[PDB]
Amino acid sequence: VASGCLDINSSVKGARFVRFCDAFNIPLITFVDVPGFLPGTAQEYGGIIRHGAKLLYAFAEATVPKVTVITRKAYGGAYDVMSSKHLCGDTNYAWPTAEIAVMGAKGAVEIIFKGHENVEAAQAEYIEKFANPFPAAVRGFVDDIIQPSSTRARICCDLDVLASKKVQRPWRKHANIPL
Amino acid sequence: VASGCLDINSSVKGARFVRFCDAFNIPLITFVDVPGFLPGTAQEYGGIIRHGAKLLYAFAEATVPKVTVITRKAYGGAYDVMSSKHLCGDTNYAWPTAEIAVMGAKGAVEIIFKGHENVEAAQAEYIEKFANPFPAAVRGFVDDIIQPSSTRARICCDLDVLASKKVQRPWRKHANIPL
């Protein structure tokens, strides 16, 4: 549905569910495949910026175990919104088809290589190096790249060892979610 | 005295003083100029490894304001031992003569460029780029490079705003300093 893109309505449902599970110590499993946000004036006039921040906050605030699996696409700011490891996640696995980037190869090459000759060669070079899960994994964004058939067993193992995990957070009178 | 090198005796005196000042909310000011550790069997047989860890711990544990000024040399592991910014420091200033490196240019070039022709050119290139305070500052190791005449005023300003600073640390029954 809608290429797996985030919009206002999806952000509202996600943030509410995540917030409940965190409050009552229920671990979270995230399956990420998101190419970006739904474009258009229907979303911009509706406050897509304000509403998208709801899901980002709901994950960032969480203190319960978070296990993320990236199945195919994670472009742009949506990578971090869908519970990336940099929001105090516990484990993050990629399948062999995962691709983590600011944008797809076509947009990135047209912007990076502007006015140069032999752009088609630059397009092939960029895709071969960046259109896979490796530029993120070699940086510590992904803990392992796993065969999909092993996903269940890998998650079960993490759940049975993160269950006793506690973290500290500064004192606050109460949270201030963007609303 | 002894080129400003750390040894067993200096580590013992430092750790004890730092620990007292931290316990009773007295800010710390550090003036760093340390080329490394005193070599030789007299120090190795005396447990220089064990004793040096005392000063590293004493700074790392501290929760009171820490302001560090680097005047000239900070080579090797001694950089971090003498209250570097990466031990939860508040501010760290360098004077124009500061040099932060793993080792001096002579040792580094002989190790990096081994068996190559025109080593003398490599020596000049290395010194011009790394024998100054810039490769550390551009990475976030140093907050500013200041004229020495302004040091006092800069420190006074930091002390009058860090005085109300509190940090959180996980619960512990009691500390376990290497001894």
Ligand SMILES: *C(=O)CCCC[C@@H]1SC[C@@H]2NC(=O)N[C@@H]21
């Ligand atoms: C064709 O150029 C339309 C591109 C839309 C691709 C998807 S839709 C939502 C995401 N936002 C974006 O700019 N690209 C993604």
Ligand SMILES: *C(=O)CCCC[C@@H]1SC[C@@H]2NC(=O)N[C@@H]21
């Ligand atoms: C001559 O080669 C002796 C070099 C000693 C220079 C100083 S003394 C202590 C520090 N340790 C080290 O390897 N170099 C520094």
